[PDB]
Design a protein around this ligand. Sequence first.
Ligand SMILES: *C(=N)[C@H](C[C@@H]1CCNC1=O)NC(=O)[C@H](CC(C)C)NC(=O)c1ccc(-c2ccc(OC)cc2)cc1Cl
Ligand SMILES: *C(=N)[C@H](C[C@@H]1CCNC1=O)NC(=O)[C@H](CC(C)C)NC(=O)c1ccc(-c2ccc(OC)cc2)cc1Cl
Lengths: 305, 305
Amino acid sequence: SGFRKMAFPSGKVEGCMVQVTCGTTTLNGLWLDDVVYCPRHVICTSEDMLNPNYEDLLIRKSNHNFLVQAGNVQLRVIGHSMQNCVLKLKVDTANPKTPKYKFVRIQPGQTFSVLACYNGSPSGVYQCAMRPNFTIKGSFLNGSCGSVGFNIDYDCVSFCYMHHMELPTGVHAGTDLEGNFYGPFVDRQTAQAAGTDTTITVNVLAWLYAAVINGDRWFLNRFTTTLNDFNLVAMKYNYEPLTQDHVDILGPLSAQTGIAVLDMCASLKELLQNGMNGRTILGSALLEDEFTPFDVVRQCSGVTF
Amino acid sequence: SGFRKMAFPSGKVEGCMVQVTCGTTTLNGLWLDDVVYCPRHVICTSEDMLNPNYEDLLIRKSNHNFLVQAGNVQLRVIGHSMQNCVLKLKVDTANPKTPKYKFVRIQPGQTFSVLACYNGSPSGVYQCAMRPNFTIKGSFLNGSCGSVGFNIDYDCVSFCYMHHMELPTGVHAGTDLEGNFYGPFVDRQTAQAAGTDTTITVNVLAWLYAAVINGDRWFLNRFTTTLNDFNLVAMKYNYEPLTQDHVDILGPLSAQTGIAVLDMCASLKELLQNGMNGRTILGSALLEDEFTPFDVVRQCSGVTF
Ligand SMILES: *C(=N)[C@H](C[C@@H]1CCNC1=O)NC(=O)[C@H](CC(C)C)NC(=O)c1ccc(-c2ccc(OC)cc2)cc1Cl
Ligand SMILES: *C(=N)[C@H](C[C@@H]1CCNC1=O)NC(=O)[C@H](CC(C)C)NC(=O)c1ccc(-c2ccc(OC)cc2)cc1Cl
């Protein structure tokens, strides 16, 4: 096809992954400057995970109870603090591989790369999207907590995600790098319901736009529509209501492809009702919503770092 | 679902990507020890690409005609040589970031990660598979030549691919790190037909096996079959004939899932004939063949580096 789900080069982020062990529990940590960030439920035993009292379990723990390993070397913890749901460990050495970074909280629909880590060593990288119900559909096993989601632009690394748990529906939930969970989720072993998920509409439109340059044009039609009428049929199929803001982001894409945004909305409208009839767009037989407009522009123009 | 296409951490490979400019043409290079590897058609002008005579165009070029840039620093070329279809540039400095590496030629069906590069700076990483017709379905633009495909195990980096061109059907063709093209392809601007592609059967079986642990079990049935009868229906649907060797690789997977290999073949057989009926396995509405058995084991057990 010529279009793939591709993640940022994980070079900068690999230099910050460390191992954090507390008692018998071990997970990944993010070593930036002289601080290491990790999920706070590292101080939890298997019995404590059913209903923890984190402020009560933390005070029992001390600096020497936290062992940080950066590969085969040891870090010495000279202070600890709880910020919401992340643990902050102050070490005596500043990470020589700390990049120009930034702690951001992303919005639903936005994408980011995930460096899946186990025991502080990188395992794999993949692209992910913040679902509108504030979950992510990742690939995580036990010991994956502490892995981070990040974006990179030019030279800066924006850490936006840290992994914490898996929901009963198999999806995943985590926090930003300040400990605040994405969504109405808490860190304890209880049945937690994610809301009714939806489809990021502006993302599907950017994907259909990407398909036009890459050869697939069979879904294109000659019908057009209006912004309202599209939203009326988008509500029924569990899609986000497109706004004038959404159209403005799809703007430069429509100027390159030469097909107006409202024309593209009509093609998706008919794709929504008429189905796919067994055909494929860009190799997929479903409608992809994990490509932002900026993602489509980045891959069809080749922005590097 | 709990299963994603995830590429190796690209940290080691980013340390070897350099820029190579010859005349007005520029592409990516791979800097290992004191040698830089790059596609040989860097010595080609736009007119020369229609039918080059590489040995005749090379002798006109000299050391000072090759400028290698490792970021903002310059490398000095102290010798050049043509190995098949790759150019070898000997520099005066050994790359300090050279990892433990190895030059391998992979077989059809095998997967590898691709670090897409432009002007010697990494742009993105994604998973790819060597199609049985010796093409790959990648995501490449102009200036992407010189990007490499690689696998990583424990600590070693096995470079298996270097990008060279795009075929009329939108797929891609390249060489190993010794210049030998994968398939019957040459480096010139002419209509080149890739053969009739097929579906890596042992890969689809490993994917259905991955779906079993991850929750999807609706495609499972109670019919069983034999190795022959499966192959007879695999030929008609353009699938590789499964061999006793293929079954042996799917062995440890069948022992974990507790379902024999031949039972799994019957389920794919019915999936092949009866279709999908609109259902989805692991979120996809098609049968994925870019997951090797070893890939499925690696992600369902968490092998790190
Ligand atoms: C971190 N290392 C680890 C990664 C998890 C585990 C496997 N896959 C992942 O993403 N994180 C955890 O184990 C956390 C720890 C909490 C204290 C934050 N817990 C969970 O991930 C978790 C929480 C609740 C349930 C659950 C499911 C269904 C229920 O009823 C049907 C009840 C509770 C499961 C899990 Cl894995
Ligand atoms: C490397 N930087 C560059 C990357 C290509 C270009 C865009 N996408 C890619 O993968 N490599 C090339 O441009 C090479 C150079 C050769 C001398 C190896 N060429 C091609 O990629 C190429 C070759 C032939 C055709 C072609 C297609 C159809 C035809 O008739 C229908 C005839 C020729 C196209 C291309 Cl892009």
